[PDB]
Amino acid sequence: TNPAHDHFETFVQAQLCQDVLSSFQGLCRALGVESGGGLSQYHKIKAQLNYWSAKSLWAKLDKRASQPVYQQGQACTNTKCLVVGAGPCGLRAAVELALLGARVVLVEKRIKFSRHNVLHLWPFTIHDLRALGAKKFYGRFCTGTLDHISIRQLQLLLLKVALLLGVEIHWGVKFTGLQPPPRKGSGWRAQLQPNPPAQLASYEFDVLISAAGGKFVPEGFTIREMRGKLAIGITANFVNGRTVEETQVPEISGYNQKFFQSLLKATGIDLENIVYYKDETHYFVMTAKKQCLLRLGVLRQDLSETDQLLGKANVVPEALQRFARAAADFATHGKLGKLEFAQDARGRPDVAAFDFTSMMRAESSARVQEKHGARLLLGLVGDCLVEPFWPLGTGVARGFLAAFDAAWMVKRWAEGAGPLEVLAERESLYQLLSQTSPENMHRNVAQYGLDPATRYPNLNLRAVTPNQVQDLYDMMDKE
């Protein structure tokens, strides 16, 4: 028996964060390496696992790692990064920073991956993930014509790649701000809760990537919010027994129908849209009008403030359950048989209401701060950059594009391009993000890489100039 093989194989199949971490530590012990140790550790792990279970994975990862943009792991070798958030986007960003050869530490306030809701994937992201070994880590990955994945499964497979690539991850620690350089010769550090170990507390970095999700409010960044017409989203997960009969039930990708009237007549349910993905669960997302929610007992009081309206006190869980099951049942014409709610992490029926009204996007995707001669590049990636409207399925795509554009920006930074040029180039790319679609991007997704010219047709990297981004560079002194 071979402990390294045993731990690698457990690591591959692990379905819980704690199991991924513990099997990875066992693997590191067996192979004479450390976790969080950069590409040198990746090289030592893979050299020692040239065998049936692992061979195909190293082939894929080495293929990506060999793309010219990474300069064989030397592009950012003097760059130190802190990534905030182990969501799909912060993990995807870290993988990229790791391939560039940067030192990558990532902090995440939670300690498990608990979300089961299902995310739509554009063709480029499906290729992207397959090319990182998704099939090895997740046997069900975008099989057939399926183009979606549950959040926690996406997190698990990206966590595994990040770990193999030597990203140093800390859990149960909340990024709360920055400790500015105290004097010349000092670097930037993070404010973290609760008190972290000497190494983390004193960890200095020149790049901060914030991928902390929709509710994180980035400091120094201007955020644009528009409150539109009230819209209330509801998501639900039902147990999928994966029977032959259940598989026949067609998905619903997304009133342009007589359907919504016939739904309203039969049930009293007034919807604007409904979506059904056949994933690890039978997952539904729908947008409901407030008046039918009040009428059907889902909402207790007609409160004018949306966050009170959709607050825990105003939502009746039993009525929300009847509402979601009745809509899902009607939408799929009963062909899923008797729907049973899947359980959330806490053991409750997995159904929830969300504010679909306000859409937020950062005014800029990056800033630079300098104090005492120490420069810090700050980048936003994922939901904290632009909040996705879930039914339209742009979340993973635009999060990953933001992750790529941030990493390219870090390559430019590492080249010594200087704060204003780095920001102007990044912002020229950012102007495109909310208009992106598969249709208007480069068609050859197999050739997508960090270089934005691989991804964005007829690229104007000067759409924004150095002079226009001056306010994004907070140079506090001349040191």
Ligand X SMILES: Cc1cc2nc3c(=O)[nH]c(=O)nc-3n(C[C@H](O)[C@H](O)[C@H](O)COP(=O)(O)OP(=O)(O)OC[C@H]3O[C@@H](n4cnc5c(N)ncnc54)[C@H](O)[C@@H]3O)c2cc1C
User: Residue 113's CB: how many other CB atoms inside 10 A?
Assistant: 23
Nearer to Cl ion, 15 or 53 (CB): 15
341 forms part of the interface with ligand X (CB under 6 A): no
273 forms part of the interface with ligand X (CB under 6 A): no
17 forms part of the interface with Cl ion (CB under 5 A): yes
Which residue carries 């407030």 as its tokens?
290
CA–CA dist 189, 429 (Å, integer): 28
Contact flags string 35-74 toward ligand X, x per CB under 6 A: ----------------------------------------
Among 11, 113, 238, 356, binds Cl ion (CB under 5 A): 113
The response to whether 116 counts as a known ligand-binding position is: yes
Helix 3-13 and helix 17-31, axial crossing angle in degrees, nearest 10: 160
218 forms part of the interface with ligand X (CB under 6 A): no
349 forms part of the interface with ligand X (CB under 6 A): no
395 forms part of the interface with ligand X (CB under 6 A): yes
The response to whether 479 counts as a known ligand-binding position is: no
Shortest Cβ 302–ligand X spacing (Å): 25
Among 42, 49, 57, 88, binds ligand X (CB under 6 A): 88
112 forms part of the interface with ligand X (CB under 6 A): no
Contacts 24+ apart (CB under 8 A), 25-33: 29/3, 30/3, 30/4, 31/4
Question: Do 142 and 126 touch, CB atoms closer than 8 A?
Answer: yes
The response to whether 383 counts as a known ligand-binding position is: yes
148 forms part of the interface with ligand X (CB under 6 A): no
388 forms part of the interface with ligand X (CB under 6 A): yes
211 forms part of the interface with ligand X (CB under 6 A): yes
The response to whether 240 counts as a known ligand-binding position is: no
The response to whether 89 counts as a known ligand-binding position is: yes
Shortest Cβ 157–Cl ion spacing (Å): 13
174 forms part of the interface with ligand X (CB under 6 A): yes
User: Which residues are CB-neighbours of 231 under 8 A, at least 6 positions away?
Assistant: 272, 287, 356, 357
The response to whether 280 counts as a known ligand-binding position is: no
240: tokens are 């999928």
User: Pairing mode, if any, of strands 366-371 and 374-380?
Assistant: antiparallel
The response to whether 175 counts as a known ligand-binding position is: yes
Bridge partners (DSSP) listed for residue 178:
190
User: Which residues are CB-neighbours of 383 under 8 A, at least 6 positions away?
Assistant: 87, 89, 213, 214, 395, 399
280 forms part of the interface with ligand X (CB under 6 A): no
Q: Using the rule CB under 6 A, give the single segment among 35-43, 87-95, 182-190, 341-349 that binds ligand X.
A: 87-95
Nearer to Cl ion, 26 or 418 (CB): 26
Nearer to Cl ion, 156 or 232 (CB): 156
Which residue carries 């020149």 as its tokens?
206
Q: Is the dihedral of CA 294, 298, 302, 307 positive or negative?
A: negative
CA distances in angstroms from 66 to 62, 205, 335, listed in the order given? 6, 26, 48
Q: In the 8-state DSSP scheme, what is residue 432?
A: T
Shortest Cβ 388–ligand X spacing (Å): 5
Among 383, 405, 425, 427, binds ligand X (CB under 6 A): 383
213 forms part of the interface with ligand X (CB under 6 A): yes
The response to whether 117 counts as a known ligand-binding position is: yes
CA–CA dist 252, 31 (Å, integer): 47
209: tokens are 């990537």
Strand residues in 151-307 grouped as ranges (E): 168-171, 174-179, 189-193, 207-210, 223-227, 232-239, 271-278, 281-288
Q: Using the rule CB under 5 A, give the single segment among 108-116, 234-242, 379-387, 453-461 that binds Cl ion.
A: 108-116
What string of DSSP letters covers 80-126?
EEEEE--SHHHHHHHHHHHHTT-EEEEEES-SS-----EEE--HHHH
Binding residues: 89, 108-110, 115-117, 175, 283, 383
In the complex, the residues that contact ligand X under the rule CB under 6 A are 84-90, 107-110, 115, 117, 119, 151, 174-175, 211-214, 216, 235, 285, 382-383, 388, 390, 395, 399
In the complex, the residues that contact Cl ion under the rule CB under 5 A are 16-17, 112-113
Binding residues for FAD: 89, 108-110, 115-117, 175, 283, 383
